[model samples]
Every structure is written in structure tokens, then in C-alpha cells.
Target: GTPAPVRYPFGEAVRLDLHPTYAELRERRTLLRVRVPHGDDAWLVTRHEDVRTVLTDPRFSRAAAAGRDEARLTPLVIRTSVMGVDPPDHTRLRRLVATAFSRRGVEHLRPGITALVRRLTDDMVGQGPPVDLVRSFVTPLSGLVICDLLGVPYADRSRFRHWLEAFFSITALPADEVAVRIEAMYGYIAELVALRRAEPTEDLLGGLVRARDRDGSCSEEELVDLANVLLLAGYHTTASQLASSLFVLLTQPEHAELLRSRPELAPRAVEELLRYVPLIAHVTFARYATEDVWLGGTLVRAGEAVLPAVPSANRDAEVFDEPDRLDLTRRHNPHLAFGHGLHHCLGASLVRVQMEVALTMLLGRFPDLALAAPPDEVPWTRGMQARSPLRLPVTW
Candidate 1:
């Protein structure tokens, strides 16, 4: 029998603590074969340049993987949204909502984001220390930001949060239960779209509904799919990032103090942290080879799926100076944290603003912020997609 394929992400500590197995894999070759949970093998691209090529090259087709029986990292139903499709369909769907997330549009969200952060932090402070930052702060802040941006009714946030947890939970629930959660979430989004059609609001989702009705551009299905993608993408990754970033800061008290002293370094700090932290264990989604192609100096066979190692790529010694060190002032970083090419994160601007505001407010408010538990005791969420603190216990 064939040997069981090596797991893609070594584990959560592979980011900073450096798993020897993953490190040896990166040093061994830029491209290596690995086994995904679905019981098939795929090429793992680790080099920085190779990762960009795999992402941007048209030879790799995300659409081809749709509806096909293939290996997947998780049991969640394959998504058919913009993230799962290729251009010009991807281009068209993305175009409808692009304007709302542009730098200008995201800038308009600053005051609202700041206000929400203030309110959440105030509640946290009022409740006193030994708090779970993930629950009290990061998760809620991420939820509200997406809500405000998409015009999701704030009253329904608790329900949305519940559904999102199930949707992304790898082992927390059975596959069938996860499927039901996905359907429930989809139904709610469809209802929201319906509500917008009846009474359009001045939010991104409402704007999309108007576009769909104004012209024959976006279909009902496309509207719901797009909303679903935005809702999950907007919060889950950012929430994970916020928790992980805060964990990094709290553990590295010297860096935390430096940021507090030099407040102007917030932007650079965010970038460096994005590069250094391996919040995302693997690429956003896998791309299948449309034809045999040379990837990272290896000729991968046609129909084979290729998974980019974002964390490994970000820490490639060739592209970064002392890639392991987290220098807040690293100015020439060309990190692929937002991703590269057509499928780059749609809410990149929004994510940065959220992180910047959240970190700044937290540090300013609690100058004495520190982890309540020992560094070794902090719990990490297990999964290949997102590995972050399940609950960041902290005291100020």
C-alpha cells in the first residue's frame, strides 16, 4: 500500500516556534508532494516566487475543480462563489462589489470602525481583567465590522456568529451538521437580500441588490453567493488574525511596549505582523492544473491540485532578510498575506483598517496589557486553514 501522505501544515506552532519537519520540507525543495485529509496527494509550493506563479498563472484553474471528486483539505462543501470560480466570471462578480472595498470606500468606514472598537473595549474594561479576548473583543469586533459594511442586521449577529463557527469548524462538528449550518446561513443571507430588495439600504449588500435589480448584471444566486463569501471572509480571517496578532504582542512584551511608545509604527507593525504570523496555515483554496506545467522547477502533471504554502512562502529565506525575525520596521516587505493575482482578498483594505484600529485602541487603552496565562498555556485553534488562539486570556 502507498505510504500515508505527510500532512500539509505541520501544526499551529509551525509559524513561530518552527516545526522541524516543515522546516526540513521547505529547505529540501521549493515544491514537494504532500497528502491532504481527503486521501489524495497534491504539490505543495513553498518558495515565494513559485507561490505567486501558481496563484496568477492561467494554467491553474479553480473552476475546473468545481463539482469534481477530488481531494480537499476539509469536509466543507466546495464553494462556488468568486473565490471558487475563475475570470471573467470571477472578474464580473468581483466588479459588482469592488468599489465598496476600495481604499476610498474603506476610508469611509474608519469612524464607524473606531466607534465600534471603542464601545467593545469599553465593555471589556468594565468587565475587568482575565477576559477571553477572542470572545469579548476580537470576534464581536470582526462581526460588527462586517455587519456595518454589508448592512447585515446587527440583531442577527449572534445567529450569524454561530453559523460561521460551524462553517469553519474542522472537528467541532460532523460534516452533515456543518452542511446544515451552511444551508441555514445561506437561507438567512437570501432573506437579507430579499429585505434589501424590498427596502434598499445604504450598505454594500443593499448596493449589490440594487445593481442586480437595476440591470441584468447580477443574478439572485450570484447575489447570495457573493454575500455569503463576503460575510465569512470579512470576519473569520480578520478575527483569527486579531486574536493571533494580540497573542504575539502580549507574549513579546518588548515589542508591545515599543508599539505603545512609537504609536506611528502601527502601520508597519501591522504589515510585519501579517508577514510574520502564520494565522493562515495554507493557501485560501487549492488550484488544479489545467495542463502539465512547470511549478517551482517541477513538472506537475495535468489535473493535479497545487496548494500554496503562504506561511512558508512569507518566511522564505531568499525573499526576506532573516525571515524568521519579526522586525516591525521591515520596509521592503512584498508579503503575499492578502494573496496575489486575481483571487487576492477583496477586503484587504478593510482588514488592514480593522487590525490597525483594533490593535491601536487595545494598546492605547491597556498599556499594561499582558497574557493572563503562561505563554505555553495559551490554547490554539486546531486546523490547517486557520491556526489561532481559541481564547486569548489576557489581563490589563
Candidate 2:
């Protein structure tokens, strides 16, 4: 029941070859459709302004038609914010998480974040030459930050990472496998939540326990969902951006050199990397319109779900003149890698800041860094919300 393979956008080929610009199937009039993987046909929206329109417009809501109908393949798994709901509920869910990841709040934690980065780098650089940044730098750094946010012990990071990876196996997996891991993850979090509720801590989960909603303190379901969001937001995209950016640099020597000469470009470079190497490849949680809607002069009828292809939208000819080019210095970038909407990525600021800090430090500490194996020999994981190089072997 998965959508026929060819009906969707950005296959593995696109990730390897075309990059920033990948196309979706459109009918004669620019209206699009995709056969959902193991499901029904859905409209795929791929364009910059159109992505924004479909995302923000009221007519189309995220509570999928599947939610309304009985034939749903899976109930939306991860919750914790506006990803699954409409205004009032989405608004409240978002606010609770925002209290910790907000600009001021995240800023307050920067020194600690940077300290962790410095400590990690100290151990990493000493073991240099052919060092794989993925294992040495990116993964551990991201894992630690998420642990800090959730009030989870840093020592427990590897355990949670394994659980998160298994949870995602739900996408292509059987019902029993999905249920087992999903329950295990929730059970682990519930124990943590119980501990936090009783003792309280400076971490995000503890803050949420103490922070009241209109009705009262957050409930078990709410706690589980919010905690899951932190876990998802934390590493899902960062891992890709971290690996992909390093891949881009390793492949393009000039870019790597520029990074060393102009360290300030690291921040700007993350945006361009995002535009060039979008994390999600296409919209996931949000779905638009079950009725006919006009976009780019095309009419899409009801019973269709909308997927805004971010990689394709970033490279839209109508928006970016040379959309495929990855310019580290690109300015005025409105790239929607995190997305655009009331449900836009809440942890985006932290993701960017962490990426810049991690990458900048990596480059500065090891200007001679190079891949340990043949470039083509690098392994890549396929078909998940996050696309990542399996293992990047590197050395100076």
C-alpha cells in the first residue's frame, strides 16, 4: 500500500546527484500528486511561495484526512507541538516548549554548551588525523545538548540514541516492532518524568512539570509528547547538517579552505548548507487541504494531502536565481529548511547555534582534516526524515 516509488519527490538518487533541486510529479497544469509510501495518493506541493501559502492558509489543516477517516495506516507517532493539531491546541503545546528553547533561555545556556564543545574537542583533536568528525564531534556534541535540555543524565545519551533510532524504524517497519520500541521509549521517559515531577531540576522537562497550563500541571500524555519533541528536535536534523556540511567541505576543497580563512562564514554557511542539504527533504507532519485548492495556477482537489518539498522549494527558479549553487556567503536567505508556519521548528535557533559552534571548532582545530577513506566509499543511510552519511572516516 505504500505509494508507488516513482510518485514521490527526492529519491536516493536526488540526494546523491541533484541536491538542492529535486522535482515532484505534477500534472499538466502544475498541480502535483504523490502515491504515499504504503498508503494513498497525496498532492505534493513544491515551490517557495506555494509552500508558504499551503502551510499558512487556514483551509488546509494538518489533522490529516487520515485522522478523519478510518483507513489510517499509522496514528501520528511523535507529538508535543503544533505538528498534529490546529490553532488553539497547537498554540499551547508550542508555548510550553518555547519557554526553554526561546532566544533568551537558550542564550543563557550557551556558555555551558560551548564548554561541552570545548571539552569534547579537547579529547577529539588529540586523537586526530583521519578522525571521523561524525563519531568524534557531531554526534556526541548533539547528544549531550539534548541530554541537557531534557534533564536526562549525559551518561544515558547512548541509551536514548538507540531508542530514538529504533523508534524511527517504525516508518518502514511492522506494527509489532513499532509498538514495542515506541512503548519502551515512552516508558523510559515516563520514569524520567516521574523523577523530575518529584525532585524538579533546571532542565526543560522539570520546568514544564512546574509550569502550569490553563487547566493545571501538564499531564502524562502531554509530558511524553513534549519530551519526545525535545528528543526529535535535538539531533534529527543536526546529525545530517553536521555530516552533510563536512561532506560538502571535503568534496569541495575551495569551500573547506574558505572556512579556514574566514571563520565568520560558518554561521552563514549553515544556512546555505541547509538550502543545499535540506534535512527533511519534504514536509512530514503538516498536511494541507482535502479539497480543491489553487496554487501556481493549478487546481488540486479534495482528498489529497500536500507535501511541500523543501529541497525542491529551495532551488525553485522563481525564487533563487542560481538555486543549485552553494554559496557560503549567501545573504538574505529565506530558506525553509526548518519550515515556515505557526509550527515552524522551535529548536531551530539552538540547532543553528550548536552547528556553528561545532563546525567552527572542528575546522579551526583541524585545518588539515580530510576523509579517511575514498570519498565514494562513505556509506549513506536512506529513506528517513533525516538523511545522514552512515560513517564518515576522516584524518588530517
Candidate 3:
């Protein structure tokens, strides 16, 4: 008789600790069969090597998952323009928008990003004790950055956030409402794209507009989707990571103090935290195996789906020494927090600089930053893809 696959995206952990099932699966050295809330059952790839392989290998296609019934977390299939497609198409879409986020490109934004963080931090520090940083700082910090980058009106941030939260709503929304939110978001982006086409101003959106005309490679839908994707993922993940990183630091006062005191350790601290933090609940997207492939001692057939647990991969003992421990000074960290390979987060460079600047400035500014509420009692976000402090209230 064939063995049944375990129900996937497993159980809860104590606080931010990963589900113990990941460790067991990694230790077992075999891919386990799993079924998510929506679509078909999938192979959960947990180990560092296997996870990396799934991400980088051409045999597993993200593009192939499009227009087909597949396993996913959300009730509605969120179309991925930059994220859904594989190379050639993926390459073309990325090239138009990628330069703005490059290491060199983002480096220029550093002073401006730093200024934004400093201005907001000073306001928070001035406002008095017990401010929810998620509201006052991290959210606005990344929010402003993305808006500036894409030429989206910062005032409309709340409007778009609501659209996105509903657009990518994990909870099954009423079908009509889903359609409404989807139209609103894409329509907004489309109008904005048209404006850029007319004027061709110099912001990120305008540049994409310029490229679209010059090369005739990107369509209006692709253009709109590019902006939509950047606006959503850029703020969502950056804000999540920043808040979670703050939560981790505030809990461990010693590490916070160490980084605050030794400024040189800032880079390592960001890297270590990126490795340790489980940014998302588990996994979101799935990769379809293009052909039969041997993975982690199991045969994944053609057209089967696989979910790579990058959070678990970050903790694999085969790669990181003492993977569970949060050592800010740890050397040789090759974290998959930004993901890996072809679909590697396009915003990776911008995010790194943002975190570096944010951590250094915030810690430097608020020497006595600590959790305002009991560590166990802090509120966490619910019914979302990411698992981070819902409201990170801190006091100096």
C-alpha cells in the first residue's frame, strides 16, 4: 500500500521558532508529500541543498504553474508577472526594472533612505514613550521608499495597502469583492502607467515606461503588473523583516547592545537576523517539476508541485553552524531570506541597504530601545502570509 503524505505547512511553534516537523523532515533526508489549503498536494523540500536546488534548477518551473490548477496558500491565485514566469520572459521583465534596485542603484538612495528613517525615528523619539513602531516607523519607512521608487503617491499608500491585503487575501473573500479589489489595484496601476507613457518622467515607473516604448518588449499589462508587484512585495517583505528583526533584537538586549556598541557588526547582524527570522508563515509559491527529477532521494514526477521551505533551509545544520542560535557576529552566513536563483528577490539589494541603515540608525538613536509590552503578550499579525509583530510597541 502507498503511504499517505502528511498534511503540509505543518503546525505552530512556540513564538517564532520553526515548526518541529521541518527539523524532522530535514533530518529524514527525504521529501515529504504535503497538501496545502488550496490546490493539489506538493513535495515539501526542507534541507539547505534541496531547497537551493529547487530554487535554482530549470527543471522546476515557476512559469509552468501559471493558468493551471496548482497548490498555493491564498484562495485566489495571485497572478505573478515578475514572479510567476521563468527565464527569457522573467529575464526581460526584470531587466527593465532591476537597475533601480541594484547594489549601485540602491546605494545612492542610502542617504535619502537614511534621512527618511532618521526623520521618522526622531519624531517617534520626540512623541513620547510606548509608540507602536510598526505604525510609526517600519511601515512608513519601507512604504515611503517604495512609493518614492515607483512614483506612486505616498498619500495613496493606505488605499493601495487595503487593495493589496484584500487582493492577496488569504482568507477566502467573496468572489465579487475579490474581483473588485483586483480591478481597483490593476486599474490604478494601469492609469499610472498611461500617465508615464504620456510624460515619461524620471522615476522608476517612468523609466519602465521609457523601456517599454524603446524596446517594445513589455505590454501594458506587464508594465502595470511590474509596478503592482514591486509595490506589494517590496513593502510587505521589508516591513515584515524589519519588524521581526526589531522584535528579535528587543527580546535579546545583549545582542541589541552589542550591535549598538560595535557599529561594524551591523552588516553581520542584519545577515544573521535575515537567516534566523521566519519572515513568512511557511511557504507561499510552488514550483512545478518540468520533468521527472530525483530530489532528496525521492522521484518528483513531471508536473508535480514542490514547496521550498526557505525558513527551514536557513536553519539546516549542514550549512549553518548552530543554525538555531542567533549570533549577530556569525561569519559565513548564506541565508535564503531573500530567496535564491533566477527568481531571487529583485529588491534584495535595496532591502539589504534599507535594513543596514534602519538598524544602525534606530539602535544608534534609541539607545534604550526595548519591548514596551511583555514579550509573550505582544500582538502578532493574523490571517496574513507573513508572521511578524502586528504592532511593535517599543520604549526608549
Candidate 4:
């Protein structure tokens, strides 16, 4: 019989650091069997190559996993929030909004986004130091940027954003409380989709609406789900990541100085930060094997849940030189921070733009920026999958 699975996620400190267990499993070149906080025992894919295989392989299907007892970080399953289908309903779903998030499309927003970031920097300057960078700068920039790209308008945007925060909370709220929040968000999105039906506009969601009603490529239900998925996928996760990015810069002042010294490296630095920083609280969602398939040294049998430990993979010694250290000028980075393959994050380029804009603008504007509180003293959100400092107090 197989030995009992160890408790998953290992243990992590509050700072922008990764637990050591990932490298241990990566060295073993085999999957680690572990029990997560929610659902069944799962195969934890830790190797860089292995993680990519599970993510890209059709045999390891999210569609197959979705209906299963999924091993995940959150307290309970999100029933209606289906991200990608196996054979791709995902293909069709992704196509409708693909152009909106394409590199060319996102670059068009650069002027305005750059302008917005500049404005926020001035506001921070006006407000003075001992300010929580997370609240003052990072939150507003990501919130405004995502809303503009997704075509989320004024009134409903504020309400739905609040609901999403609760909806994504892992254990902070009980199941019923989360369910209520999810229902409200879903209902609010449904209304937005309905409004788009009557009156069309030209933001990301508007184009999605055109694909839905203009030629009937997508269903109303799918349309609503897509909108919900974009908002959920794009909004807070970006904020969490950016907040953490700022934390990374603040804590590692050398890297922050490097960016300030060579502002041209902002894009490259964003890529490195995406690689170096831990995103999810260890592992994220599970993908079940549709059939028996070998990964690394272990065979993932059909119907088994496999959690691709991405943060671990990012630090794979085989894939990276000095894997533990952060390199801003990493030239050969193929990191899965935004993920790889069919279900790769659509908002990845948008995220890159936001990170680059935020990093360079802040560093370029304020040379003396440093944390006001000790790194450990910085407050963080508890029971959340995506880790973020609740209030990152900084001074210039």
C-alpha cells in the first residue's frame, strides 16, 4: 500500500518567500502524494518539466477534474465558476475574448494606463509618506485598469468588486456566506450581460457581447460565465500579485534600485518577478487524469487529481541557474507565472503591462522609497489563496 500522504502547502512564512519542500520534491523527480485542506488526496507535480506536462497534456483534463472531489487550497468548491473545459468549449470561449487580451490590443492601452499610473504616483506624493502602498497605489491602479479593459462601468463595478473579494476568500467566510456573495456577483454579471444585449459598446466585454449575439458563437450562459471569469481572473489576483511585487521591491531594495538605475529593464524585471515571487498560497487548482499517464517518474492513473505545484517549478534548479536567487535580467525565462498551454491566463500580457508600468513609475518617481514598518510587521490577508499584504506601509 502507498504510504500516507503528507499534509500539503507545507508551511510558509508571511514574507515573500517560498517553502523549501518544493525543491525537495523536485530533486526526487517524482510526484508527492499529499492531502490538501479541501477535497481528496492529490498528486503534487513539482518538477518544472512535469508541471508543464500536466498543464499542457490533454489527458490531464480540467474538465474531467471539475466534476470530481477536487483537491485545492480553498475551503470549498466554486460550483458555477468553471474556468476551462477539456476539449475546449475552452477553445471557443477563449477565442471570443482572445483579441481583447492580445499583445497588440493591450499595447493600445499603454498611453492611458501609463497616464493613470503617473497620476496615482502624484497622488501618493501629495498624500506623503507612511502610506500603505497596497491601499494608496497598487489597489487603485489594478482596479481601474482591469475595469477599463473588461469594460466594467462605474456603479456596478464598485459593488461587484466587493462581492468578488468575499467570493475569492478561501476560509475567511463560511460556505453559505461565500455562496451568497457568489450568487450576488453572478446575478450582477448576468445583468451586465443583459444590458450589453440591448446596447452594445466597445470595451472588452462589449466585443465579447458582439461575439455572443452578433453571430451567436457563444451562449448567454457562457457569456455570463466568461464575464465572471474575466473579472475574477483579472481583478484581485492582479492586485494581489502587484501588491506582492511591491513587497518584493520594498524588501529587496537592491532589485528596486536596479530598476531605478536601468528603467529600460522594467519589462524584463516584471518577468523575473513573475518567476521569483510565490503567487498562490503554494498550489492552486487540480487537474484530473482522463486516463493513465506517467508524469516525471510516477504514473497518474485515470480519475486521479493532480495539483501542479507551479511556484515549486519556477524554482527548479534544472531549469534555472541559481534558482533560489532573484535575477532581474534573466534572459532565458519561460516561467509559468501566468501559466502555459490551453488554459494559460488570458490576462497575462495585461498583467505584464501593469507590473512594468507600476514598477518603473514608482521607482522612477521616488528614489528613496522604503518600507515604514518591518517586513514581518506588514499585515497580510489571512485564509486567502493569493497572498497579499493588507497594508504595506512605506516611506520616501
Candidate 5:
């Protein structure tokens, strides 16, 4: 007999309530079998310690779990470079691009990123009230920032945005359509790589190409896939986060006003928002036990998929004080909004920079900003990896 399908998002709309299923999972069993969308039975780890154990332990390898020929929601779902692979290869690929998003690398781009945010805000202000934050602000801001970093032209972003949306779509897209989008995205990236090869520049992608040519550390295919991975990972999650954080602040006017009064709280506010916003419904990637291993007293056999529930862990009361509440003044917060361990988000610092610039400037610019519709009426995005608003209609 098959296990029950995990009743994923237990509540609807802006409720910070934990899913009943998650609560039950935490109470009933530390590690239990659940049905995945693909009709596979996987172990869902609910506790923070156990989730961290699954992520950090070498015994649970992502590459071993997702084989080369595995069929997924999309062909390019998980990253080939760092996301899917294990050590050595993962370490090498991560090292090549690590500097680009380091504190220094992201800091180097701050002025440009800030300027870009100002430009987008200015346009939003000029365009006036009743604007969709997702369309006008969040999406564009995210796409442009990542593009600027990768040396990808902003003009070409719309195409990839469409591809990424369909790629991460919760509703199943036709396999044929998915295949075409994958090829187009990959092909377009290949063109950019070829351009970088012919004429290496100071851009991020160009640096990768130079590394390929100079040390041959990564192959041509690896370079293309790496760029694709960076482009997608760099933007989508950040975009979702921005939109969700904005929603929280907009609804809680007191917090918004408080943040406005104390601009220096941007860093703390960002961390609090990261902890508060359960942007991801579940961890995007999964790990497989290379051999029999005991996880939270449950014996997970080799070849079985183990997925860590990030939102659940982040909400675990033992780790976070009043995990459901959004407290901007929160200190000593250590949330796994970004996955822990080897596959930790590489663009984390960049995302922080983006959030700080985005929120501070946005709140500073439009002090009177408010949602155009009722909080309950706002449409939420539908996807496992990202939980954000489909369109944030706002007015000032």
C-alpha cells in the first residue's frame, strides 16, 4: 500500500499558520514516507536538526539521487554544476564562480544595483498608482540585477523570464513545450558563451569562459549549464522573496513605518524577513542515501529520496522563538531560508544586497505605499519552490 500524499500547503492566503500535515508530521514521526507529485515515495524530514543532517552529511548525495537520465518536472530543474553534483566536482564548479558573488563581488555591483533599483522605483512612481509589484518591480529588478551580473543584456531578459516561469511551473506543462523551452534557454545561453569565448570581457560569464579556456577546469557544456543555473537561481528566489517581504510589510503598516523610521535596520530587517518569509514550500533539491543510514531513528535505505522541509524546520519552535511571527527586531536568528551545507545558495550575499537596496529605497521613496486590494484577495504564486504573490497591486 502507498503512503498518503503530503497535504502540502495546509492553509490558504496570507496565513502564517503551519500546515496541519506538517504539524502532524512533526508530532507523529520525525521521518515518514510521503507521496511526491511524480508518484515516488520519499522520506520527508521535519525537524531542523534532522534536515540539517540530511543536507550536510556526505552519506546523502544529491547526484546519486538524481541520476543523469532521471525525468523531472523540467529538463533543467536542478542545477547541474553545484546543485545536483557531490563533492570534488561540486567544489571545483563552486570555486570558479564563488568570487563573483562574494561580499566583494556583490559589493562591487552595489552601486549599479542600487542605481538600477532607483530607476525602477522612479518609473514605478512616475507610472503612478495601482501597479503590479511583481510585473513592474520585483520581476524586472531581479531579472536586471542577475543580467547585469552575468553580462546578459537586459533586453534579452523577457525571453528567459518566460522560460523560467514555465520551467518552474507548478501546473504541469506539456512535455513537448517543456523540451522546447529547455532547448531554447540552453541554446540562447550557448550563444552568449560563444560570444564570451570570442571576446572575453570583465563580465561574470566572460570570466567563466576565460577560466574554461585558461585552466580547462570546467568543460564547454559545464560552462553553459553553470551560466544557466546561475541565471535562474540568482533571480527567481530573490524575486519571490522581495515580493513576499513587501507583502508582509504592506499588511503590517506599523512594521513598515518602523522600518522607515530607522533605515539602518535594513540588514536586520532583511534577516528577519528571510526567517519570517517561508518563500519556499519545500526544498527544491532532494538527497538520496548512498547506503543504509539511520535518520532521526528511521532507517532510510539506499536509493530512497530524502527531502528536507525547509519551511517546517525554519518554523520549528525549538530553533526560532515564536517562529510564526514576523519580528523585524529579531536578533540571533539562524534560519535555513537558504539551504544549509554544500549546496547553500551561492548568491546569498548578492540577494542580501538586492533586498537591502530594494526595501530601503522602496520604503524611502513611497512612504505611503499600500496594497491596492484587500489582503485576502491578493493572488499567491503556485509552486513548490517559490511561495510569492502572482501580482502585488499596490498604490501610494
Candidate 6:
């Protein structure tokens, strides 16, 4: 079958970005019908406003119907996420951590996060040698920030770092390997929950401990799951974005110089980076159409998944002039990298803080920071959750 604008070719999809779907999405007219591994074939939602409609419309629910063959294949773990929750459940889940990630809450974190970025960048610059930016900058920047937020001890971070790595990994390793790492993460979070139960602190995990549902609730198991979700979601995704954005800017020197000269435009620079080179293979979360709906004039029936291709949406030519160009000073830009409406990323502010600090520090420290190797030769860890170079070697 010919590729549709929406569908990107599924089925044990390898290194999702490698699929033709990424490029084909620009046409904006083709809505895709693709099959997912071990699951049902679903419609892919393309274009900007069309995706927003699917995401915001409540008629399409995240919860798949019970006892369907597809339901058995759908990992319940995926369903438990705030991404996969709907209405009452989604509201409650989000509110539980709202206090910690609120704008006011994030504001207090600026000074500390800045300090961390400075210290890390100093280590890179002071090394006086070439350093892999992904390892040296992006990885550690987010690792430290999330650790500090969760109150996960710096010393203990190393122990769980592997699990966090595997959590986003797209390797062909056995399911047991993945499960083992997940179990290790769950175990560590379980111990932390116990400690929080005894004596809570001001960290995100501690807040979750004291957090209540709209009806005032959450179980110990529920808390552990939430922490795992938070930890996995918080660090890996942003780390990839940081690495990819840096790589993109460094490769395109004009954009880099523009950002360096006009530090005031760092915010727009981040948004542009996300829009031009979004790190995630997919957007927001998968939604199952509970009933038939007309999407872009096509009839999409119940029991199918919809993926809002935010990268494509952000690059829709109708909305932006030269949608593919990297414009650091682009005004009136509204990208969906952090998403929109109620299902927006909770860490949007936090990600901005990290990216702003980290990028500013990168150029300030290594004005000559450039790619040390060929673009194709430089390897990227290929996964649908979040994709980035394994080691972005750079030097001043």
C-alpha cells in the first residue's frame, strides 16, 4: 500500500525515525492506516489542528474497551500513565503532582538548576579535551535535575541509572531483561516509598506520598507506579531532546550564532529546536476512538489508536513560513513539543528551565563546540519513546 500522510508504516517498526512516515507526513492530505506489533491496525492523526482536535476531544478516550483481543495485547502499564488516563482519572492523577510542578514551584527551582548546569558545563569546559555532549551535558543535566526533584540520593542515582536507560531503550534484548530492570526500579522506588511513609520531605516523591485523589486517595503500589512513571518520563525524554537540540544547532551554525548573540531569544530557540528536531518518535499518548468520528473527512471507527504527529504538526507549511527552517528568533511560534490543552507535559516548565540553562551554558563555555565526527557516523540510540545520539562528541 502507498504511504498515507498520517500512517508511518508500523509492525515491529525499526528505529521509528527511519520509517518513511516522517517525511511523508508533510503532504498533510494522506491519513494512514498502519498496523502495530501484536496490536490492532490504527489510524495516524496528521496535521496541526487535526491532531489538536483528536487530543482535546473527550469522545475519544484513552481507555480501550474491556475484554477485547486488543486489550489483552495492550500493556496495562502503558494504560496506567497520566498520558493514558481520561477525565476524572486524568484530572486526579495530574493534580496529585501539580503542587510540585506548578509555575510557582518551578520558579523556585531556577537558581538551583542553574547552579547545576553551570557546575556540569564547567567540568566539561575545564576538562580541556573533547567531550561527548550527550554524556557530558544533556544526560547529566537532566539526571541531576530529576534526581534533585525526586529526592533520589545522588549516590543512589547510579544504581537506578541503568534501569532508567533501559526504560527508554529500543534494543532487541529479551523481555526479561527489560522486566528485570523495571523490577529493580520498582524495588528501589518501593524502598523509597517506605522511607517517605516513615518521614516525608519536600521532594516530588514525598509530595506524592502526602498527595490525595479528588476523593482523597492512592495506595502504596499506586505511589510506586507513579514514581516509576515520573522517573522514566521525566529524565529520559528531556535528556534526548537536549542532546538532539544541541546537535541540531551545532550542525546548523547560523542558528547557533544567532542564539549566542541574542540570549534574550533562548526561549524561542528552545521551542524552535523542539519543533524542527523533536526528539520523541510519537506525541502525547495513543488514544482509542471509542466511537466513529470524522477525522480530516475520513471515518475512523472505534477500537483504533491515534498518534498526533506533533513534529509534523509543528512543521505544517500552511502555518509557518519555511516550516523546516531553524529560526531561533521566530516570533508567534506555537509548537506542540510540550503539547497543548489539559494533556500537556507536566515538566514543560522544568524542561524549559533545563534546556535554557544547559544550552546557554554550552555556548558560553564552548563557543567552538562543534560536531567531532560525520553526522551519519555519529550514532543515535534509536527508539520510539525518545531517540538521541549515543555520544555527541564535541570540542571547542
Best-matching candidate per TM-score: 3
User: Could you give candidate 6's per-residue lDDT for residues 1-396 as a string of tens digits?
Assistant: 423432233432232233446456546465566554335456666688777777778767775532233421222234246765677877877878887888788989999988888888878767866788877777777888888899887578778878776565443344567677878888998898778878878888887877742245666666777788778866788887887887788788888888888888888887778787756665445667888887765677776667666766877777878877787888888777777777888888888878887888788777787888877677767544576777888867
Per-residue lDDT of 16 in model 1? 45
Q: For model 4, name the residue pairs that clash.
A: none
Q: Compared to the true structure, candidate 5 yields what TM-score?
A: 0.92
| Candidate 3 C-alpha lDDT tens digits along 1-396 | 224967765764345778888899899999988878788778989999998989889999998888568787777778778888888999888888777788899899999998899899889877988899899999999999998988998998867787877645554466567778988999888888888877888789898888788878798788888888888887777898899999999999999999999989988998999999988678758999999989877889899899989899999999999889899999788889888889888998888899999999999988989888999898777666776788888888
Report the C-alpha displacement of residue 179, candidate 5, in angstroms: 1.8
> In model 1, which runs have C-alpha deviations exceeding 4 angstroms?
1-18
In model 2, which regions exceed 4 Å deviation? 1-6, 13-16, 19-21, 24-29, 64-66, 69-80, 170-172, 212-218, 290-292
- How far in Å is the alpha carbon of 121 misplaced in model 2? 1.6
Each model's total of backbone clashes: 0, 17, 0, 0, 0, 3
lDDT of 5 at 307: 74
Kindly report which residue stretches of model 4 are placed more than 4 angstroms away from their true locations once superposed: 79-82, 154-158
Angstrom error at residue 76, model 6: 8.0
Candidate 4 local lDDT, 122-157, one digit each (tens): 888888988888877887888888888777864456
Q: What tens digits encode model 5's per-residue C-alpha lDDT throughout 1-396?
A: 535655433334243445666666766656877655552457778888788888878889888855633323333444556788888889999999888878887898889888999999989888899899999999889988888778888898767777776557544466567667777888889999988877887888999999999999898888988998888776787898898899999999899989999989999899989878877665456788888889765788877778787878887777888877778888787888788988888888998999999999999999899999999888887543577878899999
Give all candidate RMSDs, comma-separated: 2.3, 3.4, 1.6, 1.7, 2.5, 3.4
Model 6 regions more than 4 Å off: 1-30, 65-80, 169-171, 212-215, 282-284
Q: TM-score of every model?
A: 0.93, 0.89, 0.96, 0.95, 0.92, 0.89
What's the lDDT for residue 145 in model 3?
Answer: 95
List per-prediction Cα lDDT, in the order shown. 0.80, 0.68, 0.85, 0.82, 0.79, 0.71
Instruction: Give the best candidate by lDDT.
Output: 3
What is the Cα-based lDDT of residue 113 in candidate 6?
Answer: 87
Q: Candidate 3, which ten residues in sequence have the lowest lDDT sum? A: 166-175
Residue pairs whose backbone atoms clash in candidate 1: none
Name the lDDT value of residue 80 in candidate 2: 36
Indicate the worst ten consecutive residues by lDDT in candidate 6.
67-76
| Backbone clashes in model 2 | 17
